[PDB]
Amino acid sequence: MFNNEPLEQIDKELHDILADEEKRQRETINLIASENLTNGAVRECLGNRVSNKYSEGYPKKRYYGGNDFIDKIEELCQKRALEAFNVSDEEWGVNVQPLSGSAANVQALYALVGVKGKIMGMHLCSGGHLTHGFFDEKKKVSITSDMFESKLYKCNSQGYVDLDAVREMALSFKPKVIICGYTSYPRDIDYQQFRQICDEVNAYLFADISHISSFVACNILNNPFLHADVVTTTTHKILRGPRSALIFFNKKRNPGIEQKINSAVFPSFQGGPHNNKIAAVACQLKEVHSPAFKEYTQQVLLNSKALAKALISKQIDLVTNGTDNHLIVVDLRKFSITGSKLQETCNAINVSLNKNTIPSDVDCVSPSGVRIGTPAMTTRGAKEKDMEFIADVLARAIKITVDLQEQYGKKLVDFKKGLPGNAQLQQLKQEVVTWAGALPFP
Amino acid sequence: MFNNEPLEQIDKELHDILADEEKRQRETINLIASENLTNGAVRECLGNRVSNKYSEGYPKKRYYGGNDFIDKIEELCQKRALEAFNVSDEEWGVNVQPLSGSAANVQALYALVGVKGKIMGMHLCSGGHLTHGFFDEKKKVSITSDMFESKLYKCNSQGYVDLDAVREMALSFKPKVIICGYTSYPRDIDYQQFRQICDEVNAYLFADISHISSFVACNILNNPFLHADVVTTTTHKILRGPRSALIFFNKKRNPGIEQKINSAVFPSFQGGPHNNKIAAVACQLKEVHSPAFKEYTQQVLLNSKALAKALISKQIDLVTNGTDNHLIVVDLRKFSITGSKLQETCNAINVSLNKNTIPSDVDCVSPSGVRIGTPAMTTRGAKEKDMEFIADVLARAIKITVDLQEQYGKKLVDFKKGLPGNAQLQQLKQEVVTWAGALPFP
Numbered sequence: 032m033f034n035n036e037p038l039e040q041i042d043k044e045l046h047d048i049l050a051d052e053e054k055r056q057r058e059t060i061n062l063i064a065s066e067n068l069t070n071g072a073v074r075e076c077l078g079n080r081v082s083n084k085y086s087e088g089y090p091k092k093r094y095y096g097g098n099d100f101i102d103k104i105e106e107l108c109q110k111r112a113l114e115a116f117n118v119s120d121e122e123w124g125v126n127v128q129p130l131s132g133s134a135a136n137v138q139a140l141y142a143l144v145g146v147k148g149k150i151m152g153m154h155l156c157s158g159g160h161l162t163h164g165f166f167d168e169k170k171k172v173s174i175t176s177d178m179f180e181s182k183l184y185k186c187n188s189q190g191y192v193d194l195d196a197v198r199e200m201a202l203s204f205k206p207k208v209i210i211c212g213y214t215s216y217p218r219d220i221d222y223q224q225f226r227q228i229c230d231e232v233n234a235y236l237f238a239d240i241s242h243i244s245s246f247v248a249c250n251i252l253n254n255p256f257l258h259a260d261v262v263t264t265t266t267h268k269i270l271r272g273p274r275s276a277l278i279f280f281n282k283k284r285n286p287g288i289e290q291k292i293n294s295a296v297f298p299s300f301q302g303g304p305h306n307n308k309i310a311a312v313a314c315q316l317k318e319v320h321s322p323a324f325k326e327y328t329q330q331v332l333l334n335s336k337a338l339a340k341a342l343i344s345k346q347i348d349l350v351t352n353g354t355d356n357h358l359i360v361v362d363l364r365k366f367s368i369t370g371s372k373l374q375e376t377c378n379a380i381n382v383s384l385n386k387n388t389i390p391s392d393v394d395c396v397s398p399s400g401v402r403i404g405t406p407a408m409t410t411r412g413a414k415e416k417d418m419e420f421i422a423d424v425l426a427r428a429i430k431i432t433v434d435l436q437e438q439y440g441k442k443l444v445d446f447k448k449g450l451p452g453n454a455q456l457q458q459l460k461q462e463v464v465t466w467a468g469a470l471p472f473p
Numbered sequence: 474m475f476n477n478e479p480l481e482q483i484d485k486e487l488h489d490i491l492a493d494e495e496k497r498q499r500e501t502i503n504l505i506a507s508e509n510l511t512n513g514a515v516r517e518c519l520g521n522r523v524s525n526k527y528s529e530g531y532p533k534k535r536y537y538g539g540n541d542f543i544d545k546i547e548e549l550c551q552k553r554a555l556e557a558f559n560v561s562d563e564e565w566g567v568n569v570q571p572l573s574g575s576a577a578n579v580q581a582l583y584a585l586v587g588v589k590g591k592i593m594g595m596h597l598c599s600g601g602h603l604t605h606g607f608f609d610e611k612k613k614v615s616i617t618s619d620m621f622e623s624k625l626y627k628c629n630s631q632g633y634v635d636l637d638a639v640r641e642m643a644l645s646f647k648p649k650v651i652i653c654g655y656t657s658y659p660r661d662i663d664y665q666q667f668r669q670i671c672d673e674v675n676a677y678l679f680a681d682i683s684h685i686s687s688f689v690a691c692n693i694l695n696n697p698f699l700h701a702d703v704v705t706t707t708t709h710k711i712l713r714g715p716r717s718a719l720i721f722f723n724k725k726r727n728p729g730i731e732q733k734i735n736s737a738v739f740p741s742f743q744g745g746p747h748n749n750k751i752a753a754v755a756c757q758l759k760e761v762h763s764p765a766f767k768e769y770t771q772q773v774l775l776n777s778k779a780l781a782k783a784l785i786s787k788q789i790d791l792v793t794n795g796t797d798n799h800l801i802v803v804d805l806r807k808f809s810i811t812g813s814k815l816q817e818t819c820n821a822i823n824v825s826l827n828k829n830t831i832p833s834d835v836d837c838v839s840p841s842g843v844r845i846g847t848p849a850m851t852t853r854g855a856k857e858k859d860m861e862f863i864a865d866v867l868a869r870a871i872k873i874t875v876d877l878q879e880q881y882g883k884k885l886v887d888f889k890k891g892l893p894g895n896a897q898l899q900q901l902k903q904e905v906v907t908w909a910g911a912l913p914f915p
């Protein structure tokens with residue numbers, strides 16, 4: 032007693048918008064540092080009937096029965112997760128149920144500290160995520176600043192983590208968790224030196240490696256698994272999985288943390304897991320361990336270095352003046368434009384990037400930089416030589432943005448008015464569309 | 474550089490388990506009250522490339538650009554959501570971003586009362602959900618009892634919500650939200666008298682209709698939109714959608730709640746929305762508005778009724794002595810067996826049901842009932858006449874459970890030893906598999 036017509040027939044209205052979305056993705060130079068492209072195998076898992084199943088609880092400890100094939104999927108995924116990040120299932124455990132990166136962080140923080148518990152994180156403006164305790168003067172913006180008491184450290188004016196201020200604050204504030212690992216941070220992290228500040232005050236070390244997850248798995252960047260109590264990561268960014276999250280916990284360093292994490296996830300926060308997500312993760316985590324994926328990650332860095340170098344060669348400033356990972360933050364001050372404007376200009380051009388704060392910005396509205404990353408374009412097959420073109424396209428957009436601001440003014444409202452019917456943008460979009468539209472596309 | 478070979482070659486290990494799970498699903502009589510079976514179109518949406526897109530924020534108000542087609546998809550989804558539940562653009566808003574029912578409830582409750590705020594919900598053992606404020610002696614089990622301050626009202630010894638208890642508590646405890654709408658409750662709800670109680674103490678009325686959502690939409694049961702400030706529903710149970718949830722809010726009654734709810738979801742709690750989920754909901758919400766789906770919902774009630782009557786005809790007792798909805802709770806006392814044991818017995822025969830507490834039960838562990846529900850079997854095409862067979866299978870299972878208890882004792886670990894290689898269970902399983910395996914299967 033069901034309609035089994037294909038999506039096209041059953042709901043043409045929506046099949047259209049989706050088909051449109053697919054073409055936009057196909058014809059864009061996507062520089063969103065947190066985006067990637069899932070392969071057909073992952074998306075078979077996300078669309079699998081395994082999501083009909085309620086599986087509240089953990090494997091071999093389910094509330095309901097008929098969960099034996101589910102138990103095996105969840106177990107394969109915890110296993111593939113632990114080898115992916117090159118840790119022994121005797122020292123580390125992992126929860127594979129958190130529905131997103133933000134849920135994992137909240138859950139793990141609650142587990143470690145509880146309501147009213149004290150936490151430290153990097154400010155959003157300096158590159159921290161919302162779930163790292165973010166708030167401003169007039170609002171507890173993230174639950175992590177409301178159900179917890181949070182304090183936010185900054186980067187120094189060169190755009191680096193000011194470790195000494197981290198300490199000036201950690202001794203003053205005496206938190207139970209210090210978070211590092213970031214949303215928009217162009218450099219590798221000194222986890223060892225985070226591990227020493229933690230000890231000095233008896234706090235847990237929380238590492239959120241969602242942006243750099245692949246670099247950790249492939250031993251290209253510092254391993255936080257050597258110093259951290261808890262490591263979280265989304266599965267959908269540089270990792271190239273579905274939209275989901277992982278919590279890892281060091282049991283050798285804190286036994287009985289396993290129960291704390293497992294129970295904070297369920298039944299404290301979530302109900303039944305999304306089993307199609309877990310299936311999709313298992314699928315990608317296999318791929319993560321394969322040497323063809325270390326190859327991919329290596330290309331992400333090569334492309335990122337090549338892009339940074341090419342951008343500097345055309346006299347564009349980058350925060351910290353380069354990158355160790357997959358992302359660059361462009362400092363636009365010398366051109367007297369905002370990141371807000373360049374985001375709009377690149378939109379008109381089928382280039383996805385987003386505005387970013389820079390250390391000298393005293394506000395998230397109208398910031399003076401943009402964030403770019405290479406994971407998505409690398410997936411599409413772009414090699415180091417193609418970064419020249421992307422750099423070319425960005426500088427060209429920067430100049431047009433300068434031009435249009437001179438013609439229409441510095442007001443965001445006014446500025447945007449210049450964008451439609453601009454001959455140069457239309458010529459540039461077509462270059463973009465023609466190069467993008469023909470790149471390998473999963 | 475990506476691997477685009479089918480799931481079958483890329484990861485053959487996982488495809489095997491998944492194909493296994495599919496067969497279990499097809500060869501099972503699924504009486505789990507909260508389960509359903511999605512059609513192929515819903516699952517095309519879940520596996521669509523639209524989940525590559527980061528969309529933090531709301532429609533017309535995104536942080537990133539390139540979000541025009543995602544904006545369209547979300548707006549479509551809100552619209553169908555307001556349509557399906559027969560509410561107006563101007564009286565009701567909806568947020569379609571929550572990832573699951575448990576997230577929607579936590580998010581909505583926080584929006585209404587904030588940290589340390591007061592809530593009243595139905596105790597889990599009486600049929601309320603974890604996120605309705607659940608705790609016990611030893612632990613604040615759900616975040617909804619630790620983030621907030623909660624009190625739990627019970628059903629009477631007859632299995633009905635004790636409105637007198639509800640009013641008496643609401644007056645002594647002075648809460649700001651009273652939740653109704655339940656996880657395991659076989660009767661319709663008197664929202665009118667909940668609305669009345671909420672007024673006497675200046676409290677919000679919160680209705681979680683996840684189990685009955687289709688009855689509310691189709692005008693089969695009492696309409697909570699007439700009285701409630703907030704209605705939540707999961708999209709994946711009787712509604713037959715993907716795993717996700719909806720928060721409805723009555724603006725016309727609480728101006729300024731649209732903002733309080735919308736910002737609770739993002740950026741208080743969630744990050745980027747899962748766009749494949751939103752698309753799938755859209756796809757299913759269209760279907761919900763069709764009168765063919767009203768037909769399906771009606772079959773769900775008819776079957777439920779017929780199953781209740783058939784069970785009674787074989788001298789099986791039901792809590793409240795019947796059902797108004799899609800679900801029955803069996804009271805097993807007259808047979809001196811637990812629901813825990815019957816669950817085990819039914820697992821052996823490819824019948825999914827779950828143990829349930831009855832009013833006389835003094836704890837979640839080793840309860841005296843089982844909950845059965847009809848939406849999944851209805852999806853597969855079973856009619857009123859087939860309920861006789863289901864009822865006969867359960868009666869036969871109840872009897873075998875009595876025998877095995879007599880042969881092996883009352884300890885659950887002992888009991889299970891009876892199950893494998895029992896001539897009767899193997900005969901019964903084969904009857905189940907023969908009849909189930911051949912029913913329509915989306």
Ligand SMILES: Nc1nc(=O)c2c([nH]1)NC[C@@H](CNc1ccc(C(=O)N[C@@H](CCC(=O)O)C(=O)O)cc1)N2C=O
Binds near residue numbers: 159161162172215
């Ligand atoms: N480094 C970084 N961290 C993040 O968490 C993050 C990024 N970047 N990039 C996009 C951004 C979007 N998130 C947000 C969310 C809220 C505010 C904020 O300042 N909150 C105000 C809104 C300002 C206003 O409109 O008045 C608020 O009161 O909610 C800023 C960015 N985001 C990923 O999520």
Ligand SMILES: Nc1nc(=O)c2c([nH]1)NC[C@@H](CNc1ccc(C(=O)N[C@@H](CCC(=O)O)C(=O)O)cc1)N2C=O
Binds near residue numbers: 599612657
């Ligand atoms: N009415 C109802 N509400 C629900 O939320 C619900 C059902 N039924 N049926 C299945 C059940 C599974 N949920 C749970 C979760 C936790 C406990 C519980 O008592 N938690 C203790 C365990 C202590 C013990 O076992 O002695 C804990 O400390 O975690 C019970 C049922 N579930 C859907 O979620």
Ligand SMILES: Cc1ncc(COP(=O)(O)O)c(/C=N/[C@H](CO)C(=O)O)c1O
Binds near residue numbers: 065132133214215
């Ligand atoms: C370190 C970290 N933790 C958690 C999340 C949030 O994970 P969810 O989106 O909830 O799965 C992110 C993502 N951040 C922004 C997207 O807002 C991005 O990079 O663009 C993150 O960078």
Ligand SMILES: Cc1ncc(COP(=O)(O)O)c(/C=N/[C@H](CO)C(=O)O)c1O
Binds near residue numbers: 087574576602656
């Ligand atoms: C009234 C209500 N609200 C929320 C949820 C939680 O929905 P999530 O699992 O978080 O999408 C449920 C579901 N409950 C159990 C399974 O958890 C079930 O019935 O079997 C529910 O009945």
